[PDB]
Design a binder for these strands. Sequence first.
RNA 1: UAAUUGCGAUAACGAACGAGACCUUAACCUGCUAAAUAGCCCGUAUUGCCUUGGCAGUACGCCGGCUUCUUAGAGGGACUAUCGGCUCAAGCCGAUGGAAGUUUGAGGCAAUAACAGGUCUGUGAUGCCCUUAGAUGUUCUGGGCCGCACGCGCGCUACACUGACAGAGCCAGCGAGUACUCCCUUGGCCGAGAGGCCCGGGUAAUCUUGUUAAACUCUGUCGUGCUGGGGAUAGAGCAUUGCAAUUAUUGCUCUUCAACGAGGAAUCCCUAGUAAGCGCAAGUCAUCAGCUUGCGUUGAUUACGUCCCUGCCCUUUGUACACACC
Lengths: 138, 199, 92, 103, 45, 142, 10, 70, 69, 61
Amino acid sequence: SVQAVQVFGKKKNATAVARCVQGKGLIKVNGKPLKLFAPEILRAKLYEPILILGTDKFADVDIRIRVAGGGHTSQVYAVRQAIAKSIVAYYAKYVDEHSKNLLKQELIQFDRSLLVADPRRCEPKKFGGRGARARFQK
Amino acid sequence: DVLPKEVLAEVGSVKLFNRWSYDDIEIRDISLTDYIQIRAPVYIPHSAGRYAVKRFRKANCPIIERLTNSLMMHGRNNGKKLMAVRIVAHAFEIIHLMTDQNPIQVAVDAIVNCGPREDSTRIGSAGTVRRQAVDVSPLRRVNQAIALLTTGAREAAFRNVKTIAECLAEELINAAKGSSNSYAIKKKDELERVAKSNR
Amino acid sequence: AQCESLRYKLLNGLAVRRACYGVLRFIMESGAKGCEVVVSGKLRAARAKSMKFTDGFMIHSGQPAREFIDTATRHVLLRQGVLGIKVKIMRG
Amino acid sequence: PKVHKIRITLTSRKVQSLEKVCQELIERAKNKDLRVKGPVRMPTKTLKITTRKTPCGEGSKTWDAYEMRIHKRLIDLTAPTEIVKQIIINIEAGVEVEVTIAA
Amino acid sequence: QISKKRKFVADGVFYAELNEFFQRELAEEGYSGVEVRVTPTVTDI
Amino acid sequence: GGVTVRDVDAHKFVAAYAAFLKRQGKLPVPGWVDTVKTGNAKELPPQDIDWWYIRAASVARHVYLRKTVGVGRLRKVHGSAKNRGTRPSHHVDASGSVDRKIMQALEKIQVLEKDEERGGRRITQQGQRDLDRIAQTVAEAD
Amino acid sequence: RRGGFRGRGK
Amino acid sequence: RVRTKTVKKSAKVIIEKYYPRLTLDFETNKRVCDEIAVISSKRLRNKIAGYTTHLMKRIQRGPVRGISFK
Amino acid sequence: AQHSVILDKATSDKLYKDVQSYRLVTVATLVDRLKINGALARKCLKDLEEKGLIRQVVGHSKMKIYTRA
Amino acid sequence: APVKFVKVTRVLGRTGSRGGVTQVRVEFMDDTTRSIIRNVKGPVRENDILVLLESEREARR
RNA sequence: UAAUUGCGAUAACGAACGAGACCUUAACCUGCUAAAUAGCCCGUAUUGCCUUGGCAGUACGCCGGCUUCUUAGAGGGACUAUCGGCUCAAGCCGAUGGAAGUUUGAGGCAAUAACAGGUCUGUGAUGCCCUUAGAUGUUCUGGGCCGCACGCGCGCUACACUGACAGAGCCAGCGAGUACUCCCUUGGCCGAGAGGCCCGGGUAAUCUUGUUAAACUCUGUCGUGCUGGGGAUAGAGCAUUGCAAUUAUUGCUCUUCAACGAGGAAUCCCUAGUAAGCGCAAGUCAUCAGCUUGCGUUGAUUACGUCCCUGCCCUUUGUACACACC
Ligand SMILES: [Mg+2]
Ligand SMILES: [Mg+2]
Ligand SMILES: [Mg+2]
Ligand SMILES: [Mg+2]
Ligand SMILES: [Mg+2]
Ligand SMILES: [Mg+2]
Ligand SMILES: [Mg+2]
């Protein structure tokens, strides 16, 4: 039937759920186009998974993503992490892996973080983060 | 369509920074390689790396973000990489216009020339100093060179009509050659001179 | 139950050591692997002191101290003052 | 015999008894040929209280935080009103039950 | 008609009241803990 | 091809719709301009003269993106920090009358209507057609 | 100016 | 990574009591231990199986002082 | 220390015969060597940009820099 | 000054009152036979290269 | 080896505490069990653009399907599974599957013997003494605990262009809420502002709440002048809370516009989601946070050492010290 795959990406507190449906080469983010949803200087941090791979490999793929929670850079890190898994899951499931293996190896040699998440959270303590109160005379 | 027309010019060629290339790297000396990492190009400096877990993880790391990190100090400028990345990129744009060479072409020679080769060590002598005048490792040399350039820019731009956008830019071109009128050289010559005296 | 039995032994005239020892013996026949009684206060002197009686195994560290250990404490009034008692028993 | 779409709410402090309560209720209900809806998983309610450990204020200043966890575990059924009376029998201590006809 | 969250403290204080009263009254009779089972319109101790 | 609201940058679009609304030049003003504080947290009035028109237009942009919104929501959306002096800053909301009347006047222009069935104000059929027409007027203007 | 007491010698 | 006596006593007794039916593979030791032992913790179950499979590596290559499997 | 907020012919004449040789022209440069106020310098940037002698490299709301054509 | 380049071949513990100074065995990387002993302030790996202005001075131990 | 943690030699053998073991939590499980106070897809109805099949949207289904996201249970795997370079052994470092192997991270609990340490002002826990009807008991009115030539501590806003001001863009989490009297509060109207009036929802994954917070980003004004940085001090006017606001409880409007250019001898804290910057929730509360306990956004320079100062542990050694180098 219809060709589709579902992926999700996570960050510290930013969740980015993605729907990959066989389409015609259309990319839209959070409703907004790719021109808008990012800070102005970090919009570059969105195009690398596309430019490193080539636009010719996005012939019949459509992606719709909803992201929430966290901060601006958490959201952009969630979407950049979600795109790699969406494309590799669609190619692995629906087409020959001759593309998939070269996509995966070339992308991970450029950056390993596309497939694995970075675990970092905060630690509670009874004086603040890691520093205590001032002491009188040592 | 899906890509901007600006980046479409460079996407056909090999991957590089949009404004400037990473080819034609300096041939000037040795013993400073293997600690400056340029084999993997990066578009924007900003990156959430894992370089602060082991000892020498910072040796394999792009230089540009390290400069951005050292550029932000003195309490107020904590966490503002959005501001820092634009300022550093503009500084490379400013330095590009005074010299046809690549901004990284000038920047690498700037770092490689402003690194001290000797330093004085503190050995206790019951109130006196037995300064042995030890040498400096290359990694500490580049680490301190970055600090000198950043504190020089911050001190110069402090309480001055100039702005940090070109205030940072002017040291890189000044330090590219042996001008001797920069803050980094002011600290550098004093350190070798005191080591020379205290040998 | 032993805590009130010790209470009864202390209200009527009787040596504190003998009453506590009787408690220690009374624990053992039931099948407890260990027991411990702590008595504090003025041991016939102006200065106060404390005594400990212990038998069998003992745990101090883990969270099993909250459930595997049964503990109790009571206050007893005397003609001249107050004496404190603490009893712990571990049941297998 | 008119169906009323019953719903019963549960609350307790401990967690193990409620799970086997629902485990026995679902089997007690399926065999009578009643349309049963699954045991949805309600969020756990965590509550915290902070107070000073020391009772006098002398020495260093240190605090301790007590906490408490609650589970709800809602379940619903479609059946007449009289049938659920004999289906909610044999409950043990601790677990309280509240019935809502939801007519 | 009160919320469950406030109810769970009232029944805990109710259990504490039973324990404290039994310490102050039945200490001679070998008191060792109690347990309360609540049922609609009737309760057991 | 066809374009919509999503196809244009919000910052440049709002300037374009303010220029478009200049040409009609008919929105009632109760004289509140140049005297209101526009917000407790704020301290200076806006320099630009058509701040009332860019603000009324911006209110219509956000109501275009939300399904039901009221004065309280616009009250706290436009709030910011206030310098209370030597105390640390906090978050307080903007002025209420300016934001209430700037969108109360927007009803009679046939841009958005009441939502009394559940509350608030929503966008109307022919009201959206104006922003839709200006979407094509700006999109291919590039 | 001059302090005594505690541990000092010679 | 230093193991206390509790694991040590169990490892010697299991190794000497049941030598031949079990081999150098760790996967087998994990599922074998609980039928022939009463252990209240999964992590300790991993602890005993993990060391016992390392010990059989030295049993296969020569003898160890203090162990005499049947 | 104080600069001039108005531009007279005595300052006008330096511009149209000197701006052909500067590599960079900025607000800092004008307040530095032209001895003019910063607001007047920013005006000097904007009136002179439209006559068609200098080209934009990068534009921003806080600082702007211009070079030769 | 005829500044020369030298490379480190082995590190032998950390000396000094505060561990700032390090003791290494270096190789002249121009005459592979020659080898002397120097002191270094920063972290050192094998095959690292250092720049030496003067070699005649030798350090303790 | 983080450890009296072990390998082993042995006039010692076998045992009991502590560490560990243990418990909660962050991690992870494209399986099993399920889910309209949780979601997704599917089918429709259906607004606008472009017709186009299309795109941005909105509504319905209550056995249309799913659970992939989400939740919560049971058991999985974490044990280094496997592997490299050392060693007979105890043990340490790295890689691949894996998010991880630094004990994955951080906590709770945590030995014998002790201090003339703190508390009779927490307790209807308590000895002795004292006043007990001209009361040290209880209670009502008013004031005080905040009173100011001065030295000291824990903190907040600042000494500006790496800045201020004005418009626009726009991203969280932990929590809290209705009585025998109104508790968080949506929507509508009036009101510069603080506030006032009128319907309505929520004993709460349903409503407040998507808590669309701050930081931050774009476009403009100001231009190094203690100035548009900084807001101490004081006058006038308008409001809510409480029985009662003066030595104003607090808030709002206009005006007044101090000191303060990175701070002497000295001195505190800290190893990755860490320091610092910034805000939010809860507590005490009719109202007031510059306080504490937690929660989240953005997130760094240098080291992965040693016992030099100031301290801790084991052995040998010296003593005229045992209230023990005060
Ligand atoms: Mg904390
Ligand atoms: Mg133990
Ligand atoms: Mg201890
Ligand atoms: Mg009194
Ligand atoms: Mg002033
Ligand atoms: Mg408060
Ligand atoms: Mg002697």
